[PDB]
């Protein structure tokens, strides 16, 4: 499946490495765009964005984003009043659509205050879901704009997907790339732990069913998630504990993008 998301961040303190306002967009869990109060310019976060988008898209969508920077800083200054809050407080936003398999589409739009969910938009009921009393005042005010709610339902249902498909084809060379893994197995001494390791593959999806003897999967294992190497590729590891005195052999059975591999286990 694929997904397109746009985030927004308003914070009460411009303390360094976290500007007052931040807005980043993500395609299929990959950064594409960026904006913050420091640059005040929407910039690409991928080579296949500045190449397939002419200067007008970047020029006009900052003019909008600066309008959203003031709007978003204002909504944070509103919530801090209703809680009599002061100091530092974070105001977040997540919106986007994902085109799944089977063709079914989804849409979502939710806000967050101090990490916790604040209000969530329901495009199929044209209503907002409030979390506390303050969020209910926001519901009773945002709902009073039938033009607004219909516009968003249009964007989530009809127009966001057009951006997603337009973005997938642009960076099809990077987003649909296939890099096979590098599998090595190492040994660790107990105070008998055999590791199966993989580096430098891309799709972030791999199966490491670690076998035993000839044809018996080993029950007890350990797992580590797909940690990003930072060059665009991902890595993983998985460590069985061999029986102290059994003298049964082991194998790894790494499968990745339809290419299984079998390895020895010292």
């Amino acid at each position, epitope marked *: 499946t694929h997904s397109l998301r746009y985030f927004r961040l308003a914070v009460s303190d411009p303390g360094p490495v976290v500007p007052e306002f931040i807005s980043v967009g993500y395609v299929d869990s990959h950064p594409i765009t960026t904006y913050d109060s420091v640059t005040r310019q929407k910039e690409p976060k991928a080579p296949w964005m500045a190449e397939n988008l002419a200067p007008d898209h970047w020029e006009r969508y900052t*003019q909008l984003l600066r*309008g959203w920077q003031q709007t978003f800083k204002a909504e944070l200054r509103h919530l801090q009043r209703h809680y009599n809050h002061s100091g530092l407080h974070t105001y977040q936003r997540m919106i986007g659509c994902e085109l799944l398999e089977d063709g079914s589409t989804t849409g979502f739009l939710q806000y967050a205050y101090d990490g916790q969910d604040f209000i969530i938009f329901n495009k199929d009921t044209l209503s907002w879901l409030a979390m506390d009393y303050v969020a209910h005042i926001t519901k009773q005010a945002w709902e009073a704009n039938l*033009h607004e709610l219909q*516009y968003q339902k249009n*964007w989530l249902e009809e*127009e966001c997907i*057009a951006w997603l498909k337009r973005f997938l084809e642009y960076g099809r060379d990077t987003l649909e790339r296939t890099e096979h893994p590098v599998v090595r197995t190492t040994r660790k001494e107990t105070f008998t732990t055999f590791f199966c390791r993989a580096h430098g593959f891309y799709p972030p999806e791999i199966s490491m069913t670690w076998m035993k003897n000839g044809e018996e999967i080993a029950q007890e294992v350990d797992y580590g998630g797909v940690l990003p190497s930072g060059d665009g590729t991902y890595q993983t590891w998985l460590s069985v504990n061999l029986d102290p005195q059994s003298n049964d052999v082991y194998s790894c059975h790494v499968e990745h993008s339809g290419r299984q591999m079998v390895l020895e286990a010292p």
Partner: antibody
């Protein structure tokens, strides 16, 4: 990108339908405005979904696929004598203003 | 609501003309248009906030500034013929895709040799 007729005649009472056809890159909404011969335009209605907005005084139906909308002005009078301007929003949020339809009402 | 000054103007080719606008509506969006016979309203300059002037479809010969939140002024450094039209000033509720523009009374500008 937006094409709109420029003349319309109808009988006092009765009703009229000013039309607006868009060919924008995307679609984020369609707004109707009424300009009374040297006065400033006045907002009339906004449509972005498929259905018609039954406001009693008027109605506005939209067609996403066919790509057009019409404003069903009814119970006409001297006040309903103006030109009508429709504006559609681009995929990058640019207002595309049509020329305008002069709806003259027959006494 | 939204007013324009001057309501009318007659200036010579190559003159300083400043068309200003004022809004009681506490909107942060203000636009400048010119409605001409034939092609409809054409945006010139606007702003999303104080000191946030940007350009539009026809920024040729026009320059704009926004001193305060309730003032957005169109400055014609060198006036010319064919810059003569009806200039409408509009405010905008920051509703994103939905937008109800509130137009002010027109300004008939005429540039004569």
């Amino acid at each position: 990108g937006v094409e709109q007729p420029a003349k319309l005649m109808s009988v006092e009472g009765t009703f009229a339908r000013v039309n607006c056809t868009y060919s924008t890159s995307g679609f984020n909404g369609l707004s109707w405005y009424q300009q009374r011969e040297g006065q400033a335009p006045v907002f009339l209605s906004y449509v972005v979904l498929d259905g018609l907005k039954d406001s009693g005084h008027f109605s506005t139906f939209l067609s996403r696929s066919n790509g057009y909308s019409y404003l069903l002005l009814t119970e006409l009078q001297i006040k309903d004598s103006a030109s009508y301007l429709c504006a559609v929003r681009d995929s990058n949020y640019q207002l595309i203003w049509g020329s305008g339809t002069k709806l003259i009402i027959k006494p | 609501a939204v007013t324009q000054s001057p309501r009318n103007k007659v200036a010579v080719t190559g003159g300083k003309v400043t068309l200003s606008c004022n809004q009681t509506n506490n909107h942060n969006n203000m636009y400048w248009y010119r409605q001409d016979t034939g092609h409809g309203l054409r945006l010139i300059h606007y702003s999303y906030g104080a000191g946030s002037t940007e350009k539009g479809d026809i920024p040729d010969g026009y320059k704009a500034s926004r001193p305060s939140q309730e003032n957005f002024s169109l400055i014609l450094e060198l006036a010319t013929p064919s810059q003569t039209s009806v200039y409408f000033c509009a405010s905008g509720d920051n509703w994103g895709g939905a937008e109800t523009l509130y137009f002010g009374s027109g300004t008939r500008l005429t540039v004569l040799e």
